[PDB]
Amino acid sequence: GLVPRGSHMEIKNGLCTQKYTKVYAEDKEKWKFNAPHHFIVGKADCEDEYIEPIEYVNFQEGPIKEYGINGVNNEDLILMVITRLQAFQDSPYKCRENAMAITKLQECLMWLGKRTLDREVKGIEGTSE
Amino acid sequence: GLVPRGSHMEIKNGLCTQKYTKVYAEDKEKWKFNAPHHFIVGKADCEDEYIEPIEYVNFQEGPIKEYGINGVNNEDLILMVITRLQAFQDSPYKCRENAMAITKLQECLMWLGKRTLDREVKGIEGTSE
Amino acid sequence: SSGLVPRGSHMEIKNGLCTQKYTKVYAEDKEKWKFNAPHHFIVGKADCEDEYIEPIEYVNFQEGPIKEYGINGVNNEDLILMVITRLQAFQDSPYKCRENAMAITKLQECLMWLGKRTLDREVKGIEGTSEI
Amino acid sequence: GLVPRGSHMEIKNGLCTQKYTKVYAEDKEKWKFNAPHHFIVGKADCEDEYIEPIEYVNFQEGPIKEYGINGVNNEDLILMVITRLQAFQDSPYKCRENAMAITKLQECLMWLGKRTLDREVKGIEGTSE
Amino acid sequence: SGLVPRGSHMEIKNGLCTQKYTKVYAEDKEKWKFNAPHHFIVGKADCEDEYIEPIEYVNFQEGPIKEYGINGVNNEDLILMVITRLQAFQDSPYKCRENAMAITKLQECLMWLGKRTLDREVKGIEGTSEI
Amino acid sequence: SSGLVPRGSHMEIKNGLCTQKYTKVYAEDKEKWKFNAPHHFIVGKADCEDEYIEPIEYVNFQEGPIKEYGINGVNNEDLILMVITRLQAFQDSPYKCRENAMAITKLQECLMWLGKRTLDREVKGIEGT
Amino acid sequence: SGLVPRGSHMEIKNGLCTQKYTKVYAEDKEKWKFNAPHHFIVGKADCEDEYIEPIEYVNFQEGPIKEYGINGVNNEDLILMVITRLQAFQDSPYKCRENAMAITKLQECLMWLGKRTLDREVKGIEGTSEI
Amino acid sequence: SSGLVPRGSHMEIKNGLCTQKYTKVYAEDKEKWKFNAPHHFIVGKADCEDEYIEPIEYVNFQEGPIKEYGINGVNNEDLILMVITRLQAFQDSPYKCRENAMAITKLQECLMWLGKRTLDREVKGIEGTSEI
Amino acid sequence: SSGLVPRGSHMEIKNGLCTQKYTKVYAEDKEKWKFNAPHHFIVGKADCEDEYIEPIEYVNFQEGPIKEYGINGVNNEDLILMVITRLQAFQDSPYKCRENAMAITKLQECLMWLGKRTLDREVKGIEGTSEI
Amino acid sequence: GLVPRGSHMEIKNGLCTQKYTKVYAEDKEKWKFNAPHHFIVGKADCEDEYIEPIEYVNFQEGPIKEYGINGVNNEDLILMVITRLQAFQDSPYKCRENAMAITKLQECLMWLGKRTLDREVKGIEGTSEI
Amino acid sequence: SGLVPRGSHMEIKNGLCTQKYTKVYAEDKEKWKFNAPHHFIVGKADCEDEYIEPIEYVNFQEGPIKEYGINGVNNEDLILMVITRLQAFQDSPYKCRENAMAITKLQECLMWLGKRTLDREVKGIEGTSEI
Amino acid sequence: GLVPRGSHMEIKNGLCTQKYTKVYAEDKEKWKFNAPHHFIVGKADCEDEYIEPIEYVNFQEGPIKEYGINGVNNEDLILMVITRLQAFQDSPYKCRENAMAITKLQECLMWLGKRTLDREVKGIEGT
Ligand SMILES: [Zn+2]
Ligand SMILES: [Zn+2]
């Protein structure tokens, strides 16, 4: 594969291992709607010049009712992690650190949905303000 | 463009809005290494028989030693969502809820990495032991 | 004297986190609890003798599932909404502080966890019911 | 058993579904000392012109050595709810959501109290300082 | 010299601690009284496993105070030192969010330990060996 | 040899979350604080008159860069490690309780956040400065 | 309704069993094949005097399998069922020491019956009528 | 066509203590469990294809506490009693052995421990109900 | 000295599991045994003169089957119960430990086995009587 | 002859039939050294207010090395029960149940004796140290 | 490692013991002094049928303890080692229920063996040939 | 034949008598794979300074399939003891206490084997 990396930016995170993969994203300049939406997970062992793609993740950009359903939502990915972390808890791999993480993630979901429910009490959902 | 659901199971979570998208993964009977690894997010309004794919997210199955880098990690999806929310915090649409969610997700990474740092006191990281 | 009722079968809810400086909270005795919980509470003043309760306020909770018994009283979420509302007002005053913001956060997280339980009991169709 | 709503404001909160009950407080114009003090829980299935009172809850208004003990503290209501949830934990309705909420309420009490304690070190509690 | 023999002492290792310039040691688990370690050493990490090059000694209270009297520090004392220093670091050019989050965690740690103490006071068992 | 020293410029650390039932905690004068912080502390008996401090223990923190003044104190991380070790030992005894469990989760999360500051100054390559 | 004549069925009574709600019956001892009862019924205990009210029928293997096939269940299959259910109750609000002790006793039952099979297999007589 | 029935949601009870040489045991899917337990069991012939069951027997356990839902399935102590009876038969015959003796003792102690609970709860007047 | 009785025909109960460090246990002479068992026990201080018993406690077990003779003493289950109660109280104290936990489980199982005997004698109607 | 129950607490267990006898001890309020020490076996057939004492049983209160010898020890009672049941075995009433009980009772003694031995190595036997 | 003739050595096949990698062998039964085997070998089970491939030799006391003094180990020493190792495992990631159960069983085995000792010491005849 | 105690630790349990033999093992620090693996049985009256070996026992270190077969298993020792005790029960020294011990040791073997078969079902065996 080995596609080129010029526009892309490597999302580096001190809490992220970066041992076997890297995460890459669109240039800040190309960010649409205030945020990044086209991400690549690629193998770490590559020239800076190139990215070896393992996986592409694209998020919904533009409101759903104007542009259609053209990508995922943050909630969806979190669900996957939870589902899998709950599968790990229901295995020999059960540990405290996983239940801690599952709890944090559900509370994430909750906080985000609070934002939804509050923008719904005011009436306004997916609004320009 | 629709694809057959077949073995795939809808991952439904009460905490997830699930308005315009749905998440699926391989049947539980098909899971390798205790966990689902092949998720598909698809449009909600669809045939219950069919899945309308929007994105396919596939996770690493197996020890990298003997199976290679064949998938994404939970840490990578979460890096994506942390980055997007941090972007949203540079915007008109900064809010407390996002701040809380970023703090939750960061704490979720910390717990996972504690698992890993404890496996790295014992040198058994990236392995199946 | 006309503001006193006897303690009787009432219990003092004592919690080590609660100051009891001016008030004491009472509830009905355990034997009388119905539906697995205390539903009848009294806040009274601290400086009366233990034989009596000097009631400031009576808060009575919903006793029994609604589907069968209707609306007897308040729900935990209602009292928590009251307290959040006041704390947020204090935040929006000269007396804004960090401890109030923390307590607002904790109370909201509490509403969220109670909500997750309710949402799950809705998917199932068991909300408002005695079914577990 | 109706009463006129009148000046009373309805407490609408994205986190509070209002399925069965509606909380009202005193008109914002009538709030003494920066906060509402006189709440009504009424039946939700009622028209805006009326409140169907299920319960009245009145909070400590004014300084105590000036107007007397004339209502309840936040701590007291939180204590009731902690008591009930703990009682539910000791029943077939025990669950992890209840446990999480109980933990949250106790940490709420801890934070509110810090304030009192900190001020007490500075000599000033029961007072306005 | 400046080194003393490791001997009975056990290195305390935690993945979450960097352990770069220091090492934490306790008395040997076989020698713990009252169910815990109470005699800790912080020593130079770049010494040699057979020795301990001691930087600081920290001794905790061994035995309930209402039975044995005051003879060492409480957890609460050390945590308060850390909270103090972190708050200083917040009131400086190096104010940051991570320090903020650690202060919040440490204060919640104090509040939990406190509830226990408070409940025990109601029950009359504070400072005692009772459960 | 009264086990008693003069208070002097030392300041008393009075924090509302500390009872001072048995011990008082002191530190160097704010004026002698170096590098924005207190690095020399004393734990002393409470009953002692204010003019004096009765020492029980002394704690001293790394003061200045290890590079030019050497190793001359402890880290915060070290005292938190001691406390976590003790509380986990207590959880393995008739004295197990839920408050200890919480306290440990808090202290672990505290270590994780401090770790995150350092991991960030590493991915930023300005660590130790 | 849902009744069957009691007929030749014997009732199994052991003091260890209460019989408050259910009663257990098997075929008359004269009719036992292979030294053992094989056909059991559980019936409602509050039943008319002539009858059995069958809640469930469980029939066990008649014969060595190798000679006659699989005719039925084995003791191990029921004990497994019971261990599965009790463990589930433990992951429930109803967890008790008593259930735990039982699951331990049932697992040890399973281990003992197991030794016999393994020992017999070394001797090549499992599935046989040989002693 | 020897009685093969689709497996479906059924879960194979795969326990390290059961050989699976002749028979397999299946319960209903975890997702389906009521009252916190599996209640609908099948014993199937083991030498079969993993998407099918060749049922030898069906065993239905009491769903719901008896005083609330009535008598609608077997109890654990019932199955234990059957096994004890058959092993005591085996002991009075050429096939007597220590292993059977041991196993009988184990199962009697099992019944005794489950009994304590029933008795304790009977002293509490909560046996047969859904009270903890 | 004070509080002594003569050693008399009393037999010492010497059991290799009992350390005799502070106390000794005696019973009536084997030849004075009514109903196949010793009924009259004495705990005495272990450090008394040779010809003497220094009693700390006397314990008299029920002589004669219950239904035919009445009630004249205590039963084994009563002592076992005392011991279980004290060991539980100890587990609920700073002295909690695994060896107590084990012991309590043994004592309870002891009671259960004696109970099985009682329930089987009652399935025969012969409880408290001399019929085998 | 009866006595007032008063503070005394009935000790009731599911495992005790209470058919003929009842067991009482002092109010938990009054327990010294974290345990009941003053037990009374009375007759079952009596009103809740009154007790019909068949036997008093006093247990050692406080570590022996610090308060002296003042009551029985759990081990003494267990020994009595073992002795009687063994005798029953040398009788026509020999049963498996009694035998298994002796094993349970002997094993109980063995666990209690572990603690004592371990405490002896520690030098804390019959002292109040943990 | 290396081989030794199989010869008179008897394999110890017990059904509960897996023999996956290792076998256990002992002297021939006619060579048993004092009613019992005393010389045991643990060999690799993966070697030619005529050979034994030692990993470990174990020689138990042969002789009257009182008369011949010390000639080898006692069953109690091995059980003490195994208990120690299982406790170690319990203080590690390897903690599980099965280990706790086997530690309990082994301690009770030692307590039964020790009962025998204490009784032959109430009768004065320990370590001697007297029945 | 005396080797000094050195690193070795003395294993003492209230349950074991220590009258004639003493069990020693490697120091905690040298423990590999979280457990002791090298044991020495030695004479009791020997000085604390030294150990007089009577036998040496080396338990399998590391995963059997990665580091080879280099020690004995618990299973193997317990089988030796069961075997001797069963010999004793076939002799005039037959007694109930040995029979109890044989039963305890067999249930021991059953619980360890359950750990194994539970790795086999769960597929994680020997790692
Ligand atoms: Zn939190
Ligand atoms: Zn047992």
Curated annotation (Swiss-Prot), chains C, H, I:
<feature type="binding site">
    <location>
        <position position="128"/>
    </location>
    <ligand>
        <name>3'cADPR</name>
    </ligand>
</feature>
<comment type="function">
    <text>Blocks activity of the Thoeris antiviral defense system (ThsA and ThsB). Binds and sequesters the cyclic ADP-D-ribose signal molecule (cADPR) generated by ThsB (AC J8G8J6), ThsB' (AC J8CSK2, probably 3'cADPR), BdTIR (AC I1GTC2, 2'cADPR) and AaTIR (AC A0A1H7VGH3, 3'cADPR). Sequestration prevents the signal from activating the Thoeris antiviral defense system; heating cmTad1 bound to the signal (95 degrees Celsius for 15 minutes) restores the ability of the signal to activate the NAD(+) hydrolase activity of ThsA (AC J8G6Z1).</text>
</comment>
<protein>
    <recommendedName>
        <fullName>Thoeris anti-defense 1</fullName>
    </recommendedName>
</protein>
<feature type="binding site">
    <location>
        <position position="64"/>
    </location>
    <ligand>
        <name>3'cADPR</name>
    </ligand>
</feature>
<dbReference type="Pfam" id="PF24729">
    <property type="entry name" value="Acb2_Tad1_hairpin"/>
</dbReference>
<keyword id="KW-0547">Nucleotide-binding</keyword>
<feature type="binding site">
    <location>
        <position position="117"/>
    </location>
    <ligand>
        <name>3'cADPR</name>
    </ligand>
</feature>
<dbReference type="GO" id="GO:0000166">
    <property type="term" value="F:nucleotide binding"/>
</dbReference>
<comment type="similarity">
    <text>Belongs to the Tad1 family.</text>
</comment>
<feature type="binding site">
    <location>
        <position position="100"/>
    </location>
    <ligand>
        <name>3'cADPR</name>
    </ligand>
</feature>
<feature type="binding site">
    <location>
        <position position="95"/>
    </location>
    <ligand>
        <name>3'cADPR</name>
    </ligand>
</feature>
<feature type="binding site">
    <location>
        <position position="121"/>
    </location>
    <ligand>
        <name>3'cADPR</name>
    </ligand>
</feature>
<dbReference type="InterPro" id="IPR056098">
    <property type="entry name" value="Acb2/Tad1_hairpin"/>
</dbReference>
<comment type="subunit">
    <text>Homodimer.</text>
</comment>
<feature type="binding site">
    <location>
        <position position="90"/>
    </location>
    <ligand>
        <name>3'cADPR</name>
    </ligand>
</feature>
<feature type="binding site">
    <location>
        <position position="86"/>
    </location>
    <ligand>
        <name>3'cADPR</name>
    </ligand>
</feature>
<feature type="binding site">
    <location>
        <position position="62"/>
    </location>
    <ligand>
        <name>3'cADPR</name>
    </ligand>
</feature>
Curated annotation (Swiss-Prot), chain F:
<feature type="binding site">
    <location>
        <position position="100"/>
    </location>
    <ligand>
        <name>3'cADPR</name>
    </ligand>
</feature>
<dbReference type="Pfam" id="PF24729">
    <property type="entry name" value="Acb2_Tad1_hairpin"/>
</dbReference>
<feature type="binding site">
    <location>
        <position position="62"/>
    </location>
    <ligand>
        <name>3'cADPR</name>
    </ligand>
</feature>
<feature type="binding site">
    <location>
        <position position="95"/>
    </location>
    <ligand>
        <name>3'cADPR</name>
    </ligand>
</feature>
<feature type="binding site">
    <location>
        <position position="90"/>
    </location>
    <ligand>
        <name>3'cADPR</name>
    </ligand>
</feature>
<protein>
    <recommendedName>
        <fullName>Thoeris anti-defense 1</fullName>
    </recommendedName>
</protein>
<dbReference type="GO" id="GO:0000166">
    <property type="term" value="F:nucleotide binding"/>
</dbReference>
<dbReference type="InterPro" id="IPR056098">
    <property type="entry name" value="Acb2/Tad1_hairpin"/>
</dbReference>
<feature type="binding site">
    <location>
        <position position="86"/>
    </location>
    <ligand>
        <name>3'cADPR</name>
    </ligand>
</feature>
<comment type="subunit">
    <text>Homodimer.</text>
</comment>
<feature type="binding site">
    <location>
        <position position="121"/>
    </location>
    <ligand>
        <name>3'cADPR</name>
    </ligand>
</feature>
<comment type="function">
    <text>Blocks activity of the Thoeris antiviral defense system (ThsA and ThsB). Binds and sequesters the cyclic ADP-D-ribose signal molecule (cADPR) generated by ThsB (AC J8G8J6), ThsB' (AC J8CSK2, probably 3'cADPR), BdTIR (AC I1GTC2, 2'cADPR) and AaTIR (AC A0A1H7VGH3, 3'cADPR). Sequestration prevents the signal from activating the Thoeris antiviral defense system; heating cmTad1 bound to the signal (95 degrees Celsius for 15 minutes) restores the ability of the signal to activate the NAD(+) hydrolase activity of ThsA (AC J8G6Z1).</text>
</comment>
<feature type="binding site">
    <location>
        <position position="64"/>
    </location>
    <ligand>
        <name>3'cADPR</name>
    </ligand>
</feature>
<feature type="binding site">
    <location>
        <position position="117"/>
    </location>
    <ligand>
        <name>3'cADPR</name>
    </ligand>
</feature>
<feature type="binding site">
    <location>
        <position position="128"/>
    </location>
    <ligand>
        <name>3'cADPR</name>
    </ligand>
</feature>
<comment type="similarity">
    <text>Belongs to the Tad1 family.</text>
</comment>
<keyword id="KW-0547">Nucleotide-binding</keyword>
